[PDB]
């Protein structure tokens, strides 16, 4: 199964998300065009590479 | 994808000119911020409907 890699660009804020969930925007690494909004569980800063399994889905509010 | 839908919405306003002139500043500020942020993906794309949409909204 194909794993893929991306780059965390810009941390989003002010959205109503649970403690420990952060919503962020990633640009795909090997394919320099597609950006996706996804979520993270651990602490994240700007500009770091991140592993991804599922391709198609954009994230959302986690209530 | 919602950015793309936003651009189509603006072009429909440019068809309906009278809703424009009461909200020209809001339209301009939001449109420019959206493009200036999401620039790289949008310029690296290729879509002739997008090109024509940009051309008409520019004019």
């Amino acid at each position: 199964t194909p794993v893929t890699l991306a780059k965390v660009i810009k941390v989003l804020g002010r959205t109503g998300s649970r403690g420990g969930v952060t919503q962020v925007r990633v640009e795909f690494l090997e394919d320099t065009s597609r950006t996706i909004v996804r979520n993270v569980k651990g602490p994240v800063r700007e500009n770091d590479i991140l592993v991804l399994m599922e391709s198609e889905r954009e994230a959302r509010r986690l209530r | 994808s919602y950015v793309l839908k936003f651009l189509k919405f603006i072009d429909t306003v440019m068809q309906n000119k009278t809703l424009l002139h009461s909200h020209l500043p809001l339209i301009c500020k939001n449109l420019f911020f959206i493009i200036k942020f999401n620039h790289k993906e949008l310029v690296s794309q290729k879509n002739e409907e997008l090109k024509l949409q940009i051309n008409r909204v520019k004019t």
């Binding site: 002010r14 109503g16 | 919602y2 839908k5 936003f6 189509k8 919405f9």
Partner: peptide, 23 residues
């Protein structure tokens, strides 16, 4: 309760749905 951005996006979603349907 829905947040700014999310409300805009889903409203834009429905509006674009109807406009593209009529076109």
């Amino acid at each position: 309760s829905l947040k700014a951005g999310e409300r805009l996006m889903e409203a834009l979603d429905l509006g674009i749905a109807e406009i593209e349907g009529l076109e």
